[PDB]
From a paper:
It exerts its effects through its two principal receptors, FcεRI on mast cells, basophils and antigen-presenting cells, and CD23/FcεRII on B cells. The Cε3 domain is thus the critical domain for receptor binding.
The other crystal form, P21 ‘large’, with two molecules (four chains) in the asymmetric unit, has been reported earlier but is now solved at 2.0 Å resolution, the highest yet reported for any Fcε3–4 structure. A remarkable feature of the carbohydrate attached to chain D in the Fcε3–4 P21 ‘large’ crystal form and chain F in the Fcε3–4 P1 crystal form is that while the terminal units are well defined, there is poor (or absent) electron density at a contour level of 1σ in the 2FoFc map for the first GlcNAc (P21 ‘large’) or first two GlcNAc units (P1), as well as for the covalent connection between these and Asn394. Furthermore, the enhanced resolution for two of the structures reported here provides new detail concerning the ordered regions of the N-linked carbohydrate that is attached to this intrinsically flexible domain.
Author numbering:
A (entry chain A): 336 to 424, 428 to 546
B (entry chain D): 336 to 366, 369 to 422, 428 to 544
C (entry chain C): 335 to 362, 369 to 421, 428 to 544
D (entry chain B): 336 to 363, 369 to 545
The structure:
């Protein structure tokens, strides 16, 4: 049995201004009975109502999730939020905003050339590197509209040669999409980015 | 304490081909509530997902969503949700006359004080049975569900049903492309179980 | 058990007829008693019992209230004989309703009937009365349906109203009126829109 | 106490033709014993145990395996026994089954970023291959660059049935000035005929 507590996504925190944190509890057996996830703030001040979700996995695991809305000013000013896991057959996790040097991300967008026999599709790629810390949100937009999250896949932050991190994002598109409008935007949201914590670059397929 | 059990979304059933059913329990006072799925035939059920939320008025709203087999549902299996704390709800595919929906899409003229926004309205009516999904598209791409609101199906004066859908749009959207689509997914719609109408702000 | 509900006056009764009433509805010798927060006396109320199809017993008490008393913010209470419900005018900001009326085009194979739709939106508070008129004669309530007020993306509310009309009606006069009654509507709490089938 | 058993790298298996596998024991006196599912003999293995700065001891054993033995489907077994553990840990490894598909390879060069006039980042997209095992080499001056010069992401599913990785390599001005050609080479069992697919890229046109 292991538990994890995440920080707010930069998109939710800075753009949407509705940050949430998630207590993710993975139960191995799972022992009979209901797990309890209890939220608190280090200050002892009130917390909002949380959402709870659980589902039995294919391999037999019970996965439990609790998502807590947090105040925007509360989080940025350094509040510590705590998740307590209770199971009869005690785990404590906490989260607060990281401290340390900040660095904005570099962003680059690319499009693959045509692969023989696959005329109706291309792969778009985005390199986002040299940012600090590793918390970052990546989105893809078409027609100034964000595409669904499941359309793309973004790698985990790996360390660069020095202090910074990098991620790669991949988005498969169709010929119908780029013929409707041949411009796609990779957008990164990061605490150290400027202005408005947003950095974005565009790419076009430029078909023959 | 009341319980509800919904049939699959026509969009999930006919387009996504991954239908689900949802058991919703609304409880006035908290005390855990168990929601057990079973089939009238006795055959196995898949793993369901469970959600809980304490609402602003202090109520434990509990939802459980169960994937069902596509053929199993169309062939007419009956599924039961049993609530232990005993409430029993069942659901199955409707049987009876079918009628395709009529779709009408409208745009409001400019109102004083709202220069940069219009409201689109969609009237879908005279369909049978009542199960229907309503979607809005722009640039032939579906908008997020939160952008619009849709009423629950209600009886017409005759034998069909009607729903209204509302979508607020911005000047930036209709300037980029002045065409919005109200699309309905319904089992009787032909072809492809879908019928749609376009509307422009002009 | 039982649920008890207490409603506010309809804007049509409050502003046009100037004869507002509030209704205490209890759903199953049940007793319903009225009182005011100020301690002033209440008027005589009307009690009504009806048997529902499912067998449940429905009891209502309808109390006339003063026009100035309600608008100035009096609180009225219905005590059920354990149960207590209160009602008062909703405070907060005001906004007048926008009214838009629409007519469906002729649908294939349905030449002798047509559907009118009225969208009323961005008003607050949510209390609103919706009427349909033909030749300045108010049509019976059962001819139309109106949704319950729901939040827009902003602060105001919206409702949809639906009226099926006949060929005989629009041949006699092809003009129908969607009328809304609302506290913030100016100057006499009424805004309306005309619509034609063709 | 957990145990992990790896497969050989495609580079070791197909280019160098000297494959090895590694049995890793974490959170642990531990004994690691190798055997083959066929019953045929194993070679000598090398052992290295290193105490970690979080209270954990790790033991690593690397076993050389036959090239044809592995390609023809031998199963290798690592069994962990220790007094503290009640039940012995058993792990096995064999080549991945299932359909095969060669990788597509694409190589890009970033434009200049402010404050980095003397360096560029190269990126290689390798996608739609299966199974997921893959190696990447970068070549300059007709020879291979050291492995620590680049980083490759973990294999991830495409929308279809294949996998993709990205490979990242930072190059210096002196390198592309000396010769402006860099080669991203993928090593994969489904790449025909020599288990390699490569693409060249230049910093400037
Ligand atoms: C304290 O606060 C809480 C929080 O607000 C509050 O909890 C609510 O309690 C009420 C109690 O009545 C709940 O209301 C009920 O909800 C039932 C579930 O509705 C869902 O399922 C509907 C069926 O879906 C099928 O059909 C559609 C259409 O064909 C299809 O698309 C679907 O895919 C599926 O096949 C569905 O229609 C409905 O959707 C409406 O709401 C969603 C909300 O997001 C919206 O997105 C939709 O556009 C649409 O507007 C929803 O998904 C519902 O079945 C039930 O309806 C009964 O009553 C009506 C009355 O007219 C009848 O017409 C109907 O036939 C049923 O008999 C009823 O509406 C409500 O769900 C709770 N809220 C939440 C969030 O759970 C407490 O009450 C509060 N406590 C107090 C006040 O004391
Ligand atoms: C205390 O500190 C110790 C460290 O001192 C720490 O120990 C770690 O424990 C975690 C527990 O999960 C270990 O993680 C597992 O590692 C498995 C081994 O695979 C890794 O190592 C491979 C061999 O590395 C050698 O070679 C490389 C260069 O070749 C060199 O840099 C190394 O130093 C070493 O010499 C390596 O090849 C492998 O990378 C390949 O594979 C991954 C995919 O797994 C791919 O993404 C890579 O691109 C590359 O192709 C990898 O780095 C690993 O198999 C295993 O992964 C499975 O399990 C996890 C969960 O269990 C799943 O998430 C995953 O998907 C797989 O199913 C897992 O990641 C870690 O290796 C230990 N590290 C060390 C140094 O021992 C403790 O955890 C700390 N805490 C405690 C309480 O003790
Ligand atoms: C049985 O199957 C289960 C489901 O497949 C397995 O559960 C998985 O267990 C792993 C590790 O035990 C979890 O991985 C962790 O993920 C969290 C969070 O990752 C997500 O959130 C971050 C930030 O919020 C986001 O950036 C990522 O993209 C993810 O969306 C990490 O913090 C951990 O370090 C770790 O990587 C899986 O999340 C978990 N899956 C589920 C569905 O719960 C289980 O391990 C299997 N068990 C056996 C015995 O086979």
């Amino acid at each position: 049995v292991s538990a994890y507590l995440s920080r707010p996504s930069p998109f939710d925190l800075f753009i949407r201004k509705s940050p949430t944190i998630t207590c993710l509890v993975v139960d191995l057996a799972p022992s009979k009975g209901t797990v309890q996830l209890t939220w608190s703030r280090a200050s002892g001040k009130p917390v909002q109502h949380s959402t709870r979700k659980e589902e039995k996995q294919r391999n037999g695991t019970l996965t439990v999730t609790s998502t807590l809305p947090v105040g925007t000013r509360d989080w940025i000013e350094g509040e510590t939020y705590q998740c307590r896991v209770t199971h009869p057959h005690a785990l404590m996790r906490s989260t607060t905003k990281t401290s340390g040097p900040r660095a904005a991300p570099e962003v680059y967008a690319f499009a693959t050339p045509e692969w023989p026999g696959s005329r109706d599709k291309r792969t778009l790629a985005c390199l986002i590197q040299n940012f600090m810390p590793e918390d970052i949100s990546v989105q893809w937009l078409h027609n100034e509209v964000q595409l669904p999250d499941a359309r793309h896949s973004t790698t985990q932050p790996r360390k660069t040669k020095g202090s910074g991190f990098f991620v790669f994002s991949r988005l498969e598109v169709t010929r119908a999409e780029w013929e409707q409008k041949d411009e796609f935007i990779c957008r990164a949201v990061h605490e150290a980015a400027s202005p408005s914590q947003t950095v974005q670059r565009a790419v076009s397929v430029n078909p023959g």
